[PDB]
Ligand binder design. Structure first.
Ligand code: FAD
Ligand code: HRM
Ligand code: DCX
Ligand code: DCX
Length: 513
């Protein structure tokens, strides 16, 4: 029962740390709470679905780590379907479109919406990726909620409603819940607004053939009996050179280094000895998990396609069960499906229904949105409620409430003696994602390897070579995106246009042109 390293948690972060340590000849024990690995990724297998991700599923350009780890484990990606039209459903109306963002035809709302995404990205620029609390405006921004920033930068109700939604979709909580500072950073560290929100060339570009659960399943395969299921860790005691780990059934393991590869809320439940610094205890108990119910509606035929819909719906409607959807049809066209998310407060309220009613209401929304009755005839329904997962807390990730970042934030990933911290929440690139889980996992392993004297201080943070199979097409903005003014910008200019048109009339009246 003695090891160099014990990794607490066998999600992608944990297994990445363990896989890397193992590569260096270091003995590692992964202790995993559930009867399975993979954590917030979970690929369910049955006859009705073949396979399906009920947890994390999508990968895209710039996520080079999860790509490189996926590949080398023999896992291949395929493209999310966007061949047909995306649709936006607002105010009872279905609006097909083709871009990453629903087109805005009101010229004023257009400016508003343009300036919103530009400002988010621009404000992100300011924020240090590794150290968001060091941002020039950090205290100011960290005190505001994302609702307050949205309402401050958007004049139109259209753009605020979309923004709120955008917040829901990306961090699975309500704008009023999350720090504006943390959110600007969150978006910056995923590559900006276009990158985070897009399918083509964005974070939703791709899925894994056979599911993302296979990432963890196969690292566990490599690890053999150095991974232990059903071992929830409850105590971590680093008083002596041999750190003692205790699991829920009172088994004990000893090691030299611990990697904590679970989200903060669950890190909050571990009895640490000595106690973590008060600062750190506050931070980990103050980062709540977002909320999602992921829902899979199966049909005989991908009827959305024949109406020229790809099956991606941005549903901006407060009565609506679902917020957003993608086609989830298998790469060969078999088992046509719509992956739907119920997010943020809507998840919390829909969780209160029976599954059949939740299914009923979703079919009814699909029927409406897609303008077909075939939606009311599913051959199968899968759902997974992530809030109700004791070993996850929710999905996708933790969110930072206002103030937390500036007050406790600076230690999310700081070692505590010989305890190192991983988990996607400690990542600096695609934190919140399977990508971030790998980054954090490997950097923690490197922090440990560096303790063991096997890796240099410079080598703790390694750059991922860009993926050759899924290269990052650079994100462009049109001349007009760059240069069109905000609503209030329009006004400052119009009041110039007007001033001088006016003096162009006093100069024309007095022949002084
Ligand atoms: C519905 C849903 C949709 C998502 N969408 C995507 C997506 O499309 N693409 C993407 O990249 N990401 C997505 N995410 C987020 C992504 O799944 C996570 O960011 C990533 O899986 C986090 O991995 P981790 O290893 O850091 O954490 P986890 O996967 O949470 O792993 C933690 C591990 O610790 C175990 N554990 C917990 N407590 C203990 C304990 N005390 N002792 C021992 N073990 C413990 C848990 O069982 C788990 O296996 C989604 C997540 C969900 C749930
Ligand atoms: C733009 O349409 C979508 C569809 C699914 C997701 C999306 C946007 N953003 C997501 C995120 C951030 N995670 C999981 C799924 C999606
Ligand atoms: C005085 C107002 C000038 C603003 C003009 C905005 C043009 C709206 C069309 C944008 P689309 C992305 C092609 O739908
Ligand atoms: C002041 C006159 C308005 C000029 C037209 C603005 C719309 C430009 C089309 C949109 P994009 C190509 C994506 O930036």
């Amino acid at each position: 029962h003695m090891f160099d390293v014990v990794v607490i948690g066998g999600g992608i972060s944990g297994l990445s740390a363990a896989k890397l340590l193992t590569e260096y000849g270091v003995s590692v024990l992964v202790l995993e709470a559930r009867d399975r690995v993979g954590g917030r990724t979970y690929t369910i297998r049955n006859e009705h679905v073949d396979y399906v991700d009920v947890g994390g599923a999508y990968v895209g350009p710039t996520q080079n780590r999860i790509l490189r780890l996926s590949k080398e484990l023999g896992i291949e990606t395929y493209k999310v379907n966007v061949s047909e039209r995306l649709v936006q459903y607002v105010k009872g109306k279905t609006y097909p479109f083709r871009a990453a963002f629903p087109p805005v035809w009101n010229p004023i709302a257009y400016l508003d919406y343009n300036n919103l995404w530009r400002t988010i990205d621009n404000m992100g620029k300011e924020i240090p990726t590794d150290a968001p609390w060091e941002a020039q405006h950090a205290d100011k921004w960290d005190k505001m909620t994302m609702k307050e920033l949205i309402d401050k930068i958007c004049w139109t109700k259209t753009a605020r409603r979309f923004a709120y939604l955008f917040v829901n979709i990306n961090v699975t909580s309500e704008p009023h819940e999350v720090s504006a500072l943390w959110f600007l950073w969150y978006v910056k560290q995923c590559g900006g607004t276009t990158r985070i929100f897009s399918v083509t060339n964005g974070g939703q570009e791709r899925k894994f053939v056979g599911g993302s659960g296979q990432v963890s399943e196969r690292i566990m395969d490599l690890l053999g009996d150095q991974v232990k299921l059903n071992h929830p860790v409850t105590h971590v005691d680093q008083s002596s050179d041999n750190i003692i780990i205790e699991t829920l059934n009172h088994e004990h393991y000893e090691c030299k280094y611990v990697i904590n590869a679970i989200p903060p809320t669950l890190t909050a439940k571990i009895h640490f000895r000595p106690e973590l610094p008060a600062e750190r205890n506050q931070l980990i108990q103050r980062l709540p998990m977002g909320a999602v119910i992921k829902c899979m509606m199966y049909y005989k035929e991908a009827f959305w396609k024949k109406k020229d819909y790809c099956g991606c719906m941005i549903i901006e409607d407060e009565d609506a069960p679902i917020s957003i959807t993608l086609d989830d049809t298998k790469p060969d066209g078999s088992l046509p499906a719509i992956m739907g998310f119920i997010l943020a407060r809507k998840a919390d309220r829909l969780a209160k229904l029976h599954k059949e009613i939740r299914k009923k209401k979703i079919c009814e929304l699909y029927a409406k949105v897609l303008g077909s009755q075939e939606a009311l005839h599913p051959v199968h329904y899968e759902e997974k409620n992530w809030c109700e997962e004791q070993y996850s807390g929710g999905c996708y990730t933790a969110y930072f409430p206002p103030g937390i970042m500036t007050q406790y934030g600076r230690v999310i990933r700081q070692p505590v003696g010989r305890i190192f911290f991983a988990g996607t929440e400690t990542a600096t690139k695609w934190s919140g994602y399977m990508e971030g889980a790998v980054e954090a996992g490997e950097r923690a392993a490197r922090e440990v390897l560096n303790g063991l004297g096997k890796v240099t201080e410079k080598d703790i943070w390694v750059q991922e070579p860009e993926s050759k199979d899924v290269p990052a097409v650079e994100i462009t903005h049109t001349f007009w995106e760059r240069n069109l003014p905000s609503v209030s910008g329009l006004l400052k200019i119009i009041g110039f246009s007007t001033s001088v048109t006016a003096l162009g009339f006093v100069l024309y009246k007095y022949k002084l042109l």
